Amino acid sequence: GAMAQEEAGRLPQVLARVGTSHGITDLACKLRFYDDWAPEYDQDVAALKYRAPRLAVDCLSRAFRGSPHDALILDVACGTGLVAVELQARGFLQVQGVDGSPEMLKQARARGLYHHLSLCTLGQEPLPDPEGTFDAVIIVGALSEGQVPCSAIPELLRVTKPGGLVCLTTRTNPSNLPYKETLEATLDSLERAGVWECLVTQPVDHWELATSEQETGLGTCANDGFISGIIYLYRKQETV
C-alpha cells in the first residue's frame, strides 16, 4: 500500500468477516501501461554517479609525480576493472585488486588491466599485499559500509610505497555535523605525523550548510548531504 501512511502497524482480525480489510472492489480492474524501451544503464541511476571513481584517477595522477608505469595501484572487489582500464590510460599500467565475486572477478581478470586479482573480503584476514608494494590505491566507500573495514585501510596505505597516492571515500555520518571534525582531525594528525598528505579532494556537494538545510519539503527522499559522500586523495609519507 502506502509507505508514508504505514506507521506502527495494526494486526486487526475479526471472526465475523473473513476479509482483513473492507473493499472487495473486484467488479473491475484498472489497467496500467509502462514504457518497454527503458534504457539499459538507466536501471540504476545511483551506480552511474561515480562521485569518486573517475574523479579519483584524474586527480590522483594529477598529483602523482611518480612513474605510473612502474607504479602499482590497488582496486577493490567492485568490478572496478573499468577504473583499472582508465588507470592504464593515465599511465597507471600496474593495477592489482581483490574481488569477492567469481563472476565479477572473471570480468575484471579477463580485462587484463589488473596485474593480479584474488578472492578476499576485507576484514576476513590481513591483506595479501606486501608493504611498499603498490605506489597507489583507489577504493571509494565500502570502508564503513562493511566491505573494507577501517582496520584494513591502514594495511592499504601501509602496503603503498612512499610518495604514493591513496584515494579513499566513506560515509561521514551526515547525522552528526560536528562529528565530521573528529574524522577530519584524524587525517590532519596523520598528515602532521608525516605518514601521508593530501593530494586532492573531490569537492562534495554535501559541504553545503547542513545545520539548517531549510527547504520547501517537496520530497527530499535522499539525504541532503550533511557530511556523507566524500572522496579525497592522499599521498603516502608526507607532512601537513
From TrEMBL:
Domain (Methyltransferase) spans: 73-164
Q: What InterPro entries does this protein map onto?
A: Methyltransf_25, SAM-dependent_MTases_sf
Q: Which domain of life is it from?
A: Eukaryota
- Pfam families listed in its UniProt record: Methyltransf_25
Q: What is this protein called?
A: Methyltransferase like 27
Q: Which organism is it from?
A: Mus musculus
